[model samples]
Target: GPSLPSAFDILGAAGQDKLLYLKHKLKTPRPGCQGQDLLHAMVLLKLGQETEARISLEALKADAVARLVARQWAGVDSTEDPEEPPDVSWAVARLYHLLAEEKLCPASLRDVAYQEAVRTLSSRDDHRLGELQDEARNRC
Candidate 1:
């Protein structure tokens, strides 16, 4: 199967207005789609809505699936260190993959978000964002 579009692709394709709509959609997603919170928080972060994003992230952190994702930015005080090493965990990676495929699939768009999340949660190499991207491309 073809690899899904990445968040970069989605952002480019959706533009600001569409992204905003999608963000809101993911915010109060329908039943069985709560994992959309992870994607929604990422969207909020992308839009520079740090406060709201953090609130969502804080809420997500309580969930076992999002614990590592939240920890990736737990103490992040600035946007400058996005490449900082994350606290990697296979459990988190597995969870993201499962949820992305089973709960949030078209397998053509959300997969990218899941891939990005998995890549972020599976690396502790601060200086290898490009390499991580490559790895994620190969894996997801």
Candidate 2:
């Protein structure tokens, strides 16, 4: 899975930043490339370009991969769209989950199994660490 560039890096570049590349990539009409659009939109959102994000996200609403990205970007619970996401590695998912949580995007694990895996991988929060510990014990 492709990763998002840091906000600072995207902003620091003059014209050919990662966000610009993403925008360009998405704008090019390709079959089954809606995911690229959503990714570009997410980059814009991370850069505080809300209007562009909304436009891109709207277009991607019906797509499976894009929809998954949109749900997180909108801070909506994962239940709104329940389709199984593409097969992403644990490392990739963890990175995205951490970034999403930091951005205050509604963090959702891709599946129940991933949920458990994520709980173990992520750092504990005082408010929920105990619950996570219990869940881990039960899973074990």
Candidate 3:
């Protein structure tokens, strides 16, 4: 199984510096690669670039498992004011779950990612976390 660190761990380790590093990586991704798009969109959202994030998410359009994820993000971006900072925690939560589902997320870190998503989503006091939690439980 793949053994990369969980998105949660990476984000925590990167803390305030994560987005800067992710942005740099995104700048030079290999052509036709979709693996990093979800993470990139999350970084964009965190950096208050909802529109750009939505545009970047288009990269996932051709991936069957990730197309839904991209649609979800695009829907969110469309509903919100482009200039406003997005609900980045929620975006990250969803992104991790989506990545895990797509098998793009590391197998060893899947549970950790799901747990972090639940924790972050739960903190928002939004009932939507239930759906995410259910999905995580089902998948794990």
Candidate 4:
């Protein structure tokens, strides 16, 4: 999983100081970790550089998990000419789901199930947390 900077850490989960610490990390390095593109997409959104996130997600064109992240957080829905999001993660999915709840983009999840689960929990509400949590343990 990613270590240096989670999108959540950037948003408010971490100290404001580290927020700036990661704020300065980027193409700057390119070390891949737990789906770097997916991580980048959310960080940019948290930074209010949403459009920037779209291109980041778009970079992973054929990636199933990547596609949904774009739709759920970067506003890249099927109607926007986004390729079919073949299927869809748990930790990273949680980031996208939180973005969904924030109306940052739209509905999308926190599970390693099919892309369907991603869509399921994304648009759904917190009432579904335990639902995904159970699956999380099972999948783990």
Q: lDDT of all the models against the reference? A: 0.51, 0.48, 0.55, 0.52
Estimated TM-score for each candidate = 0.46, 0.38, 0.41, 0.46
Error of 3 at 124 (Å): 35
lDDT of 1 by residue, 28-123 (tens): 756533346776766676576777877888776545434544544434443333443434333333224433453333444434554655565456
Off by over 4 Å in 2: 1-16, 30-34, 76-140
Off by over 4 Å in 1: 1-9, 73-140
> Ten residues in a row with the worst lDDT in model 4?
105-114
Encode model 2's per-residue lDDT on 14-127: one tens digit a residue.
244655655565466665232345446666765677776766777766665455555665554555636666533332333344334334233343233346444544644346
Flag regions of model 4 displaced more than 4 Å.
Answer: 1-11, 15-17, 29-32, 79-140
What is the alpha-carbon lDDT for the whole of candidate 4? 0.52
lDDT of 4 by residue, 11-114 (tens): 55644554445446533535323344465566666667777778877777677767666676677766545354442334455444434434432342322232
Error of 2 at 82 (Å): 7.1
